[PDB]
Design a protein around this ligand. Structure first.
Ligand SMILES: *[C@@H]1O[C@H](CO[C@@H]2O[C@@H](C)[C@@H](O)[C@@H](O)[C@@H]2O)[C@@H](O[C@@H]2O[C@H](CO)[C@@H](O)[C@H](O)[C@H]2NC(C)=O)[C@H](O)[C@H]1NC(C)=O
Ligand SMILES: *[C@@H]1O[C@H](CO[C@@H]2O[C@@H](C)[C@@H](O)[C@@H](O)[C@@H]2O)[C@@H](O[C@@H]2O[C@H](CO)[C@@H](O)[C@H](O)[C@H]2NC(C)=O)[C@H](O)[C@H]1NC(C)=O
Ligand SMILES: *[C@@H]1O[C@H](CO[C@@H]2O[C@@H](C)[C@@H](O)[C@@H](O)[C@@H]2O)[C@@H](O[C@@H]2O[C@H](CO)[C@@H](O)[C@H](O)[C@H]2NC(C)=O)[C@H](O)[C@H]1NC(C)=O
Ligand SMILES: *[C@@H]1O[C@H](CO[C@@H]2O[C@@H](C)[C@@H](O)[C@@H](O)[C@@H]2O)[C@@H](O)[C@H](O)[C@H]1NC(C)=O
Ligand SMILES: *[C@@H]1O[C@H](CO[C@@H]2O[C@@H](C)[C@@H](O)[C@@H](O)[C@@H]2O)[C@@H](O)[C@H](O)[C@H]1NC(C)=O
Ligand SMILES: *[C@@H]1O[C@H](CO[C@@H]2O[C@@H](C)[C@@H](O)[C@@H](O)[C@@H]2O)[C@@H](O)[C@H](O)[C@H]1NC(C)=O
Ligand SMILES: *[C@@H]1O[C@H](CO)[C@@H](O)[C@H](O)[C@H]1NC(C)=O
Ligand SMILES: *[C@@H]1O[C@H](CO)[C@@H](O)[C@H](O)[C@H]1NC(C)=O
Ligand SMILES: *[C@@H]1O[C@H](CO)[C@@H](O)[C@H](O)[C@H]1NC(C)=O
Lengths: 320, 162, 162, 320, 162, 320
């Protein structure tokens, strides 16, 4: 006797899926909406390459620690990659003021150009070749940060410096300078003659005065002295006014800077991978349309939403 | 249970008559389910708003309070998105399976309606004809044109016979 | 399809007999659906907890890390609410439409129950009576009081004729 | 033969709605739960008016920049509205310390009243009428912040000031003062006689010392000098103790302040609209019970949840 | 309505014949519902990701902007979790009740299919037999083995008596 | 005439439940997923006890305010509990620098041990027994913070102190010291002889210089003077170098500290309950597997998600 039956598809899929009332339900077809993979590499972000600092910190790179002696132009970048512990940082120990906000400012940069603003030869009444230290070697011989100048007394004098630099460029300028904290009265006269010293710095917004702290400290990189560095953004028609009678670490170079956009500092040990992406993680780039991912929380770019899951599997087919 | 033999679709027919048996898929309702399930997935994907962010660790050792504030925010959103994603998948899976069910039971009903008393509901998804249904008769129930008049009598007689 | 002619409700009946035809809305089940759908909307609205917040931009040019923390927070909640709101609307729309479906198919069923073989399921939502059903007979199927015995035999003998 | 049919409502609505499995489904009735509209105006918030500053910054208003004289009282307010770029701010250039926390403190104020605390006439041994500047004009003529006093040497002397003010009011007092950074030794003796100066300020919590930074700076509003302003909340039975031998910009007026709640600063170019609301945005007030809105993120008040959508439409009726 | 009497399960049968009446729970489908509803609750509980956080008020009187930032974050998450939790409970309650409905209507259907015209759908969940159904007949409908031929004719003739 | 019916369970439960389309629906069984209860007590967190400070602030405890004489010697703790307003804080008025970050650092501590690092009897050329004050009484008699020493001139001299302490322990050391702001020149010579004084503090990272602010201030706890305290973490092989000719509040004791994890400060008026928990709130511990709770927002531990609800009731049974 003739029969017609109504039924549904089946196959040898083992794909399993959970439901709010049932677990481990085998189905015919399924789709995972969790992105689990990455390409293992550091990539450009929307067409622009990161600034990969390698064994230098942002500070060492900026100030020109002579172990970072590699000053190549990258004139723009989309993020900065630093190692967890760069080996080259402040070779001569001390500080960089507002360092984190500076790194944040520099995280993404549309135009960056190193320019000479105050040539070494312009210091006629001070020594410009004796401010070097075993703490900052270059080719094993004592040296110093290459973008600033540690002025020393000449003959037996340090006349009071009064200079100004006008930003005649069309771009903001990032300028840096510093103060040297000497160790005692003898060292102070030995280097600068004048025992009681100061540095004054003025722009249209800046109004700074630095005074050395002549005191006993522990040794770092062989030195008990310290150098405290400071910075400012000198706007296109403004000028910066320096005055000092000692302990002044002067600008030499400075940087034309155009901003446009923000990012952050990525900590990764990886090297450039000659790739492009919309979503970078410190262990590799993500290339996905999926709405969720479980790769890494410290992402830069436009990424899926980070979650704690192994598996987000939607049923598409039937019970099997 | 479901049918290993049906290869060309999601829902369909097994016909058992004189000329031999065989499976055929219902095109229309299979396509309706593929469209719907495809839409579901794309909706769950396409409704996610994605935006540029830069996530790092920019606070120093005397800014641990602020760092903690960031931790609580990050973990917060992770807890929100994890729960919502997990539950969403659980709930929509339930519904997708209920959707298939409902589609199959609607097929069954649109056949039940063409046949009426010319066949017997076996109660296992199958219809036992009270008459002889060749491969063209079978094809006719499949494309919704089965002609009840042709067969009423032969079925009437075979029904009253029991 | 649906009916332009039915104006006094959501679900109902079109009756075609001697005294003329016309539409009548099922009051009770229409009201059920209105109450339910109304509760749904209100629930989606009323369950939202609202609180005072003051949102501005209070951080200066040397507090950009903290400003970034706020940005990630703001954008984060925007992403959460957008996705939830959009998906919530999608899911509850699916359900609302399935709810209407289910309500209509319950009406059809409770009629099918009363009528049995005194009428013929045309398979398009309509019942063709095997007997004569005046405006009080019609009214009776509508309020669930239609009496099957009264008509069995007139229907029993209009059947085997054709 | 008679027929009964079951069916459902239909109409000529074109309203469309999406579903998780279907798009562009025409329905009978529908309801949008996204608030898209606002009244285009700046309103009171729960019955209390904002402080609308117009062409002044909070600093210019507080210090009494003479282009802001206009001192009508609002004795209380629910939020402050500042223009993106108020024209009148620190007429004599410089800073206001902790400015952003001050603005946040003043964002919402329950009682605010200007009172005289140290009358001009009380300075018998210093000049009180010569501290005016072309940087702070009133109708083309040199003037100065109206709530503080730029004291100058008298005869050829600036004796050391030692004064105190006890807060005998029942309310906290917001008090402001400043230090003048002069440009060089000649100007310093010209204005204050004493070359080496300071300001000391003490309360029960405050312990401050200010020292002028005599240095070269760029011109702003015609001036190379600067004025750095500072503030404190003097509690009801506390006293404030000032001491200075120069460069002191002294309180004259101060403000009774009662705090209660918190708010923030709204940036808007709009003016007051003589309306009331629970939810203000910088482009207009929202009046809604809807759970979501897409108007603007920078809301103050109790608002729906902000989202990125055009449309959140719930089906209420049937397929059509 | 429901049955205060039936105590050994969630869904079942009341049988009214000569030997006396009594309730019998359907074991299988009752267990299915208990498992499912139990899984639902556990899924709602177990899918929550919980993590360690330390929540305090560590900011001072000149850090009110940051404190505000923490407030907006805390309140933000409270608003997210409140709405989600409340709506989740509302939606899953709807479904749980519909699930019970669907389970009961599947029982009713599988009986309706066995009985056919040997009994009369009273329309209140009950079937009135057109024949004598002893305690073994009753048991037979319950385990799906009721045999329709055995009774057709005693019914076919008590039916055409009305 | 024989009948079979299909039906379902019912009982005399009054439990009610809402649905998205229906309210106040009575059901057979129901389950509330909102945790509403707590044990009313302060507990250990994952097996480790809190530091319960009672009537002392962290500052008063750390510096050894003599009303904090209750040093039960907790060598580790999981969180700190302070009262809303500890009565005993800086008995001699002033400040503790970076106080909030310090508290955050000390919120959870794996090992904490008070050790003597500079014995009192080591100060041969300065007075060590005269630095006490009615502001810091013990048993009603004048005293002082027990962990630091208020050095005074001896004979009529205060020779310049130059000392260093090397951290020879294997653990970091938390060290604290302070500067005394005297009230006028007479008091200054009376206590320290030298009129113009300073303190210098140096480590491998620290480079500090403190100068007293000799000025008029209001009375607090009977005193117009102030003491500003400062701290550092001295790493295992580093040394700290102090130099001063006056106004120096010297370390005496210090603390070995091992860190490991983070927590925060809990404000509670409650009492230790000899209990353990995963989740502490300031009004009691939570012991629950529920996904939500409404007890309190200021939780420490792994807690359910905090919400504003009375009730989250899932239906488990049928309509009744
Ligand atoms: C910074 O310099 C500009 C430009 O100065 C002129 O060009 C320079 C290369 C140099 O040779 C100067 O001597 C020139 O004066 C200043 O802007 C000019 O300021 C002058 C002086 O008052 C004014 O008359 C002009 O209108 C400006 N000239 C141009 C070409 O813009 C500017 O103010 C200097 N800034 C500071 C802060 O000192
Ligand atoms: C600040 O002022 C109050 C009030 O001073 C009194 O009231 C004035 C109007 C005037 O007549 C004064 O001479 C009065 O002394 C001081 O409070 C009084 O002083 C102490 C409390 O510290 C106590 O002897 C009194 O009971 C207080 N009397 C009242 C009515 O409050 C207060 O001490 C002064 N504060 C400082 C820091 O000096
Ligand atoms: C801090 O002291 C350590 C410990 O060194 C020694 O033991 C002390 C108790 C004391 O007796 C010292 O004189 C001893 O030298 C110093 O550690 C030494 O490091 C230097 C290298 O810079 C070297 O002379 C020793 O051999 C080291 N010994 C050990 C055990 O490490 C350390 O340098 C001192 N640091 C400072 C900043 O003073
Ligand atoms: C559910 O399934 C989990 C993973 O399943 C694994 O792969 C499938 C194809 C089977 O072969 C299964 O046996 C494998 O282990 C299990 O590991 C898990 O324990 C299961 N959970 C329950 C509740 O059954
Ligand atoms: C869905 O429809 C969108 C535009 O629809 C327009 O607006 C409504 C009010 C109707 O009246 C209709 O006539 C209009 O065309 C499109 O943007 C979109 O592409 C459509 N969806 C699909 C799947 O094509
Ligand atoms: C729903 O019920 C609300 C309060 O419920 C009360 O407690 C329960 C346990 C029952 O005893 C109930 O009868 C009580 O009223 C009412 O206050 C509320 O108005 C009701 N709302 C609706 C829409 O029915
Ligand atoms: C990501 O994956 C696709 C498909 O696998 C691949 O071809 C390409 O590398 C990527 N595409 C885009 C658009 O980023
Ligand atoms: C908001 O709109 C409602 C509803 O139309 C109106 O009646 C009410 O007066 C308005 N509320 C305010 C504060 O303007
Ligand atoms: C929490 O409650 C259980 C049982 O309700 C009780 O025995 C004990 O007090 C607590 N258990 C744990 C693991 O803290």
């Amino acid at each position: 006797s003739d029969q017609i039956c109504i039924g549904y598809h089946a196959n040898n899929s083992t794909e399993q899926v959970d439901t709010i009332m049932e677990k481990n339900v085998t189905v015919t077809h399924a789709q995972d909406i969790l992105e689990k993979t990455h390409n293992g590499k550091l990539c450009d972000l929307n067409g622009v390459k990161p600034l990969i600092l390698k064994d230098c910190s942002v500070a060492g790179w900026l100030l020109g620690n002579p172990m970072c002696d590699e000053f190549i132009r990258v004139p723009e970048w989309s993020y900065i990659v630093e190692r967890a512990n760069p080996a080259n940082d402040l070779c001569y120990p001390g500080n960089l003021n507002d360092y984190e906000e500076l790194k944040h400012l520099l995280s993404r940069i549309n135009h960056f150009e190193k320019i000479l603003i105050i040539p070494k030869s312009s210091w006629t009444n001070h020594e410009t070749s004796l401010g070097v230290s075993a703490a900052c070697p270059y080719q094993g011989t004592p040296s110093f940060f290459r973008n600033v100048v540690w002025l020393i007394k000449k003959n037996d004098a340090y006349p009071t410096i009064k200079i100004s630099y006008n930003n005649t460029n069309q771009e903001d300028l990032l300028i840096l300078w510093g103060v040297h904290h000497s160790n005692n009265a003898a060292e102070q006269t030995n280097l600068y003659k004048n025992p009681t010293t100061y540095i004054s710095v003025g722009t249209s917004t800046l109004n700074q005065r630095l005074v050395p702290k002549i005191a006993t400290r522990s040794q770092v990189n062989g030195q008990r002295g310290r150098m405290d560095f400071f910075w400012t953004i000198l706007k296109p028609n403004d000028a910066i006014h320096f005055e000092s009678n000692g302990n002044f670490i002067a600008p030499e170079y400075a940087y034309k800077i155009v901003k446009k956009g923000d990012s952050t500092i990525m900590k990764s040990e990886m090297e450039y991978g000659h790739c492009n992406t919309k979503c970078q993680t410190p262990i590799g780039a993500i290339n996905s349309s999926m709405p969720f991912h479980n790769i890494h929380p410290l992402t830069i770019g436009e990424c899926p939403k980070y979650v704690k899951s192994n598996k987000l599997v939607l049923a598409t087919g039937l019970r099997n | 249970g479901g049918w290993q033999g049906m290869v060309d679709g999601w829902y369909g027919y097994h016909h058992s008559n004189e000329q031999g048996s065989g499976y055929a898929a219902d095109k229309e309702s299979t396509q309706k389910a593929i469209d719907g399930v495809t839409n579901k997935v794309n909706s769950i994907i396409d409704k996610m708003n994605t935006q540029f962010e830069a996530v790092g660790r920019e606070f120093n050792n005397l800014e641990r309070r602020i760092e903690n504030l960031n931790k609580k925010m990050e973990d917060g959103f992770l807890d929100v998105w994890t729960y919502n994603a997990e539950l969403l998948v659980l709930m929509e899976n339930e519904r997708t399976l209920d959707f298939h069910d409902s589609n199959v039971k609607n097929l069954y009903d649109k056949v039940r309606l063409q046949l009426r008393d010319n066949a017997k509901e076996l109660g296992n998804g199958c219809f036992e004809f009270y008459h002889k249904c060749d491969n063209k008769c079978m094809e006719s129930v499949r494309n919704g044109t089965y002609d009840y008049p042709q067969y009423s009598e032969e079925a009437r007689l075979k029904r009253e016979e029991i």
